[model samples]
Each structure stands twice: as structure tokens, then as C-alpha cells.
Target chain A: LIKPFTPLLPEVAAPETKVPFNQKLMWTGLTLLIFLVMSQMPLYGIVSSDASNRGTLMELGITPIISSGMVFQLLAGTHVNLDLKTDRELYQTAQKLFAIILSFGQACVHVLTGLYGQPSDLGAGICVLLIVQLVVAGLVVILLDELLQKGYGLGSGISLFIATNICESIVWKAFSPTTINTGRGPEFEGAIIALFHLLLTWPDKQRALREAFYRQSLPNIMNLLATLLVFAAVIYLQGFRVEIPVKSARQRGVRGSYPVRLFYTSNMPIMLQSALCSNVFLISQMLYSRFSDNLLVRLLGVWEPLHAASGIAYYMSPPLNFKEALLDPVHTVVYITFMLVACALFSKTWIEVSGSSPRDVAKQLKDQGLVMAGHREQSMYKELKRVIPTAAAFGGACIGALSVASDLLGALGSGTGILLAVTIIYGYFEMAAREGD
Target chain B: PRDFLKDGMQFIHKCQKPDRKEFKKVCQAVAIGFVAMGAIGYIVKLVHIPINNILVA
Candidate 1:
């Protein structure tokens, strides 16, 4: 499917000169700031009503580009004949091409799904302009990710963006002063502020306390607690590792341990899982809109444009909160199981595709003149085989389970978003410390 | 007889088995997490009514 587009892949050359540490940090900060600004920049042609429904210039954000790359990786990982594991250059080239195509595809799908609302409401010209802006924005995000990855930044652009978005949402949900009409009266949108307001004004203090804890809609105290709990749990999970001892070939006395983290695939598995789920929901929603009566489409999904109220879409959508999950236990269970299995599968695939598989790690160790300390006579492959696969499987399941738990608990920004943020932040901290050393 | 199913079952069993100590720790973590989530949810659910009333009023 992606073969024809291979020739159009962008040729990315590494920078000729070395960028200073401070300079790199500056670039990272600047890129993040640009992304933030772009996210706020309104689309060129959409009216205020339409604009309210739509995301700004960064409508698609990094989602389309990331999701597209994930699709290609999944294909490569599952299919042995693709040979993406060995052919590094081809893998990268294919990834770039697929990303470009998928970005365009996602942009179109999102528009058609009425994520930006029906084009008929706006003139055809304006609709086209909106779609163009989204595609361009997606491409710009890809470029920024590349710029960070090519040694101009402390961490990858994707991680930075995910963490930034998660933090922004968390802060906005916690403290934003914006008033929302809750069908009753205007109330502070921020969960904390709303709680305070309720406490101060309500005649019955105990009742106010109860209401502050669990609002039926919008950000609630539970979501805030869940977010914090997830954050701490993720940090703890990151510290869980199984280390394999290795000895330098030349200096037999020098020994070190290769620590395989519980999150071996880091945020990739969850990101891929979420992207896959969202893509399915998006595609199904688009189909259901056009063919509402079609049996197949109905079986797949149905959406009310505002939300997936029934059919497959309802089952696919992540439950908004604990109450929602409690209301529909079956859907919650199905969704959690699906996420767990998909995440595990993706994690396994990720190890193979990213050259972190047992065989690949063995090869890397051999190349670097490192060998298993106790098993010097045996092959590095033999030693690594004992630990890598098991670690990968276990780590994948842990992350998958964690994400589901967080979601069920109604973690703000969704379970996957919190998982990504915690891991990314920890990763950046580690990278910064290493740089300092 | 289809041996494929038997082969798959064996693979699954092998994968499911984990180091005893590690498995124990994982179980503990999962239990604690579930408990924490329920406690948080229950507390929040209890609080939602008054807040809704205040906003509505």
C-alpha cells in the first residue's frame, strides 16, 4: 500500500556542524513555544460558531503524522517479509512516505467526519481552506518532530508535545476561570475553582462538599486525584527494571548492567494503541454519517456527530469517567481488554521494529564488544534471549493494564495521555541529567 | 486432529508463567491501583451533587 509513495520521501541530512548543548535546549524550547502558538492560532476562514467547534491551526496536531507512522510500524512488525528490522534506510524512507500520505488522509477523514462540522454550513471554499490548513499544520508538526530528533533538541518533538498538551489540559481543567453554563447557571469551568465556589455559596456545607467531589459533567475532583495517582504510578513503574550484567571485551574488569525498563517500549505502545482506536472511531464515524442506513456501516459504528451514542462506536469510545464505566460495565471491559491486547501486541512489535529485539540487542552488544559476564563462552544472543522477550511481554502488559486502570479511574486528559506525559517527563529528566554528566 | 490449537495453548501457557517474585509484586501493584481508583471515584461521586446544586442555583 505504501510502496508507490517511497520515491517522494524527503531526504533528511544530518547537520554538518555540532550544535552546543545550550543552543540545542534553546531550539527545543523555541519549537515547543511555536507549537503552543500555532495551537492557539485560529484557522483562516472558519466563522466564530464553526471555529468554536474546530481546533485552531494545529487542528490535527501531531496525531495524524504519529498515527500514520504507527500504522507502517505495525505492518512491518507483524509481517516478517517486510524486512524493516534489517533494512534501516528503507524503514525510515517508508515511514516518512507513509506519514505524509496518512497525514493527508487523516485531515480529509477528520473534515468529513464533521470534526470541524459540516462543510455545507461554511462555503465550499472555506471548507477546503480549513482542510488545507489542517494538512499543512500536520506537516509542520512532522517537521518540528524531525528537527528535534535530528539533534537540535533535548527530547523528541512528539514526547514534548504530548507532555505539553497533557500539562496544559491538566492546568486548564484545574484552574481555568472560564465560566460554563451548566444548564443551571454559569459556573467556573475549572474543577478546583468550582469546588471552592460551591463551598462558599451553598447553604448546606456537607452537600456542597459532596457535589464538589463528583460533578456529573466537566472536570471533577476525582479526575484530578486520578491524574495525580497515575502520575505517581507511572513514575514508580518507570523505576521498575531488570538489569542484565555485561563485561567489556577489552577490559574484562569493567562490568555494567543493561537495564530493561518496565516500560520497554516507553510511550509508543499506548500512543499507537490510542491512535489505532481513534482512527477506527474516525473512519467508522465518517462511514456512518454517509451511510446511516447501510447495515455494515451501522454494525461498525454510529455517531450523533456530538458523540458516538450507539453501535460499535459507543463500545470503541473510552468511557469519560468512572460513573460512565459503572453504567456500562460490558463496554468498559471490552474496551480495556482490547486496549490491553493491542498494547501488548504493539509493544512486542515495537521491540522488533525498533531493533530492540533480543537478536538485535545481541548483535548491537557484539558490535560494541560487550558480552554477558558469566556466559562469556556462550553467544550474547543466547544470554539475551533468556531475559529480553519475557521483559518485553511483562512490561507491555503492565503499561496496558496501567492505562486501562487510569482510564477507568477517569484520569484527566485520558489514561493514555497521562501515561505519555509521565514517561516523557521522566525521559527528559534522565536525558538532561546524562547531558549534565 | 488439529494440532495448531494445542500448539497455541502451549505458547500461551509458557508466556503466562512468570518469575514468582516479580509476579507477586505485579499482583500487589494491580490490587493497590484498583483500590485507589475505586476510593477516588466513590469520594468524587459523593461530592458531585452539591456542586451540581450550587451551579444550578
Candidate 2:
């Protein structure tokens, strides 16, 4: 009843196996440290209370590095394929060169963008100096990642580096406690209580713990739990799924015929939807920030009609007028819903291009002398043709729905990042163990 | 009908093919991509875009 191909699936190891253990550990530690330092630099700009510092840090510290990494990866992949005569070593060499060059270029973009909108008093020389620092720091991080991946077999070093940035941003936002979230929520109160309890729990210090929990920790914990619960529910609903059955004549000995999943359109829809929503929000905020008192802009819901100082987008604000319908809760929900729908649609469209079915497999199998008895090759092929796409569509939806839920819950940040990191870490650990074995 | 359904389940369980690896890989990729995309969306809401606004006239 059981048919197994491989006795065990090999552990997913880091990208390279040639590096020594000490070198690998050193590189990994250095990479993390670099990310921590770079992430903190931007905060210096934010806390200085200088608008110029804030903008410069964001421009140089963030966007350029991301864009550069993305573009460099895409281009290197594209070029390597086009040039077939280039050996594997040559391809690797070319990729490193491109990545290094792109890192510098990315730093330049950051510097240039930072300089675009500045006050008269802001010095150009200071900006240039910051840019140089940013570029050097960024390249050091990227190079460390590359070395870890190639030298030790960590395939997704860049993604890990990006994850580090996300972690730093979250921590900074939490610590700063600006008008955003205020950090005075129920959770903060609970922490105070816990601290008091720790002190009081020491016999004579019992009163301290009791007072702290009652005075501080309880309220913040309540608020945090309530907010988190509501948010979690919203995300859970987003991830709920429906299953579809798949039948294949050619799949004579396969498992799992029904495709069960929540969202059909997977991440593309979510990505596209977020891109649209963010762009609109940014544009509206920018317009309001610039022209604080334009009647037309107010009417358009780009600016608040009355208390124009909230700094939030008009369309996204409550007490929605006709203009605000675009950002209505219903509209936002529907936009997310439709994004998944679109992913499903595209997944189906992709099947047409991929030729994924049992019939295709059967046809090839018959040519290779593995013919099924009673079921003709054509019939087997046809059955497979019917089943594969159906399964794919369901699988794709499940993936999309799960992702949407994670994103909605704010678990997408450290949740997915740490998940990926743990996987890579474990994988490398295993490889290291195995190498010793 | 019950017998037919039982047969169908059995058939599904027993069916095996060489392309199983390909199908599984595709499914895995699709799942990872979806989750990654969802994460990006959540981050935008948390940090980039304002969650709720009060537009008073």
C-alpha cells in the first residue's frame, strides 16, 4: 500500500558547503551585527527632530538597498541565461560583480533622493558624508550575506538581511512611541504590573508586585489583547478556505485528489492590492501635507475637510463622504478579496502555458515504455490534463489565503522571517553536523 | 453512493505517479509565495499606511 521514492528527503542545507565552520559562524554573526548597526543609523535621523535627517536616513538607509538588491538579482539571473558559453564559475563571478556594483549604485540613488527635498539650511556636504557612510555599511552587509551563502550554503542571505531590517524597524517603532500607537496601550500596563509583582514576590516586596500589576500592567494588557484579538479575527477570516476535488485517469497511484485551500490567487493578488492601496494613501497624504488648505483637495477627500491636522489620508478617514468611498472599509475588504480572486484567475491562465496534466505525463511515459494496461495513453493523458490544473488552482488558493491571513495578523514580519531564518539555520546546522559525520 | 465514495477515496490513496515530486514542489512554491506576499501587505498596513483615519468636516 505504501510506495516511497527516496527513503528520506535530504535536509535543506545552506547554499555552499566549502566554508569552514568557524568562518561560517563568524560571517553569520558579522552579518547580523552589520544589519543591527545600519538599522539604528536611520533612527538617528528620525530622533534628531530634523525633517532633513529623517528623509535622508529613509532614502539612503532603506529604499536604495532594497531596489538595488531586487534589480541586481533579476538582471544577473536574466544575463546568466542569455550567455550560455559562460561556465558556472563565470556565472557566479559575474553575479558577485553585478551585486557589488549595484550596491554602490543603490547608495547613490539613496543620496540623490535624500537631496531632492531639503530645507535651505541643510548642508550638501553633510548629506554626501551620510550617503558615503550608508553605501559602505550597506555594501559590507550585502557582501557578508553573499559570503555566507556561497561560502557556507545559505541560499537566501539577502532575504535574511531584509528580514533583519524589518526586525529593527519594528523594535524602533515600538520603542519610540510617537503619535502612532503611543505604546501606552494595555500591554504596557501589564508590563508595569509584572515588574511590581517581581519586586513584591520577594517576601517583603510582595506589595510592589501587587501594586504594579493593578496600577500599570492590567490596563495596557487589556487594551493590547483587545486590539490584537480584533486584528487576529480579521486576518483569520481572510485566510479561511474552500476545497475543490481533482480527478485524473493517469494518476493511478497518487495521493490527495482533492485540493483544499483558502485563497486561489496567492501572494500576487495581495502584493498588487497592497501596492495600489499604499500608492493611493501616499499620494493623498503627500498632497495634504503640502497644501494644507486647498478646497478642491478637501472635497476630493485627499485632505480632511475640517480638522486638517491629523496627517492621515482623507479617503482612509472615517465619516466617509462620497470622495472617501474609495477607502471605505467595505472597499478595502473587497479589494483584498478581489486580489485573491485575481490570483486564482492568473493561476488558471498559467496552467495553459505550463501544460500540467497526467495526460502530458502519460504521453511522455508511454514514449519511455511505461504504458498503463487497459487505460490507453490518450485517455490517461486526458485524465491527467483535467486533474493537474484543478489541483494547482486549489493549491495556489490555499497558499494565497494563508498568506493574506498572516499579513492581516502582522505575523508576516518576524513570523515568516524567523520561520525562514530558523529553517536556514537548522539546515546549515544539519549540513555542518553531516559534514562532521 | 457510499460505496462509490469509498472507492473514490481508495483510488485517490493508491494513485501514484513519477510527477508527484513536481506537483508537490509546485504546491510548495505556491504556498511560500502567497505567504510572502501576504507578509508584505501586512507590513504596509502596520508601518507604511495609516490604519484608520477620522475625516471630520
What is model 1's native contact fraction?
Answer: 0.00
lDDT of 2 by residue, A1-437 (tens): 11131232122244544666676666665655554434433322212234223432334444444555557565655554554644554544544455556666765775565544242345555556655666666556555555565555333565555544444343332332232234532223224344543464456576654544344213322323433444333333232333233233365554232332233333334344344556766677677677848876665444444433233343232222223334456654653556456555666665554444455556665675443333333444554455455545554454445444444433323233323333333334436556653
Looking at model 2 chain A, which ten-residue stretch has the lowest summed lDDT?
A1-10
CA lDDT of B9 in candidate 2?
A: 44
What does the lDDT come to for candidate 1? 0.70
How does candidate 2 fare on TM-score?
A: 0.50
Off by over 4 Å in 1: A1-17, A43-55, A59-147, A183-185, A294-297, A302-314, A327-332, A375-379, B1-57
Model 1 clash number: 8
For model 2, the local distance difference test gives 0.45
Q: Provide C-alpha RMSD values for all models, in order.
A: 9.3, 13.2
Residue pairs in candidate 1 whose N, alpha carbon or C atoms collide under 3 angstroms: A210-B47, A210-B48, A211-B47, A211-B48, A211-B50, A211-B51, A213-B44, A214-B48
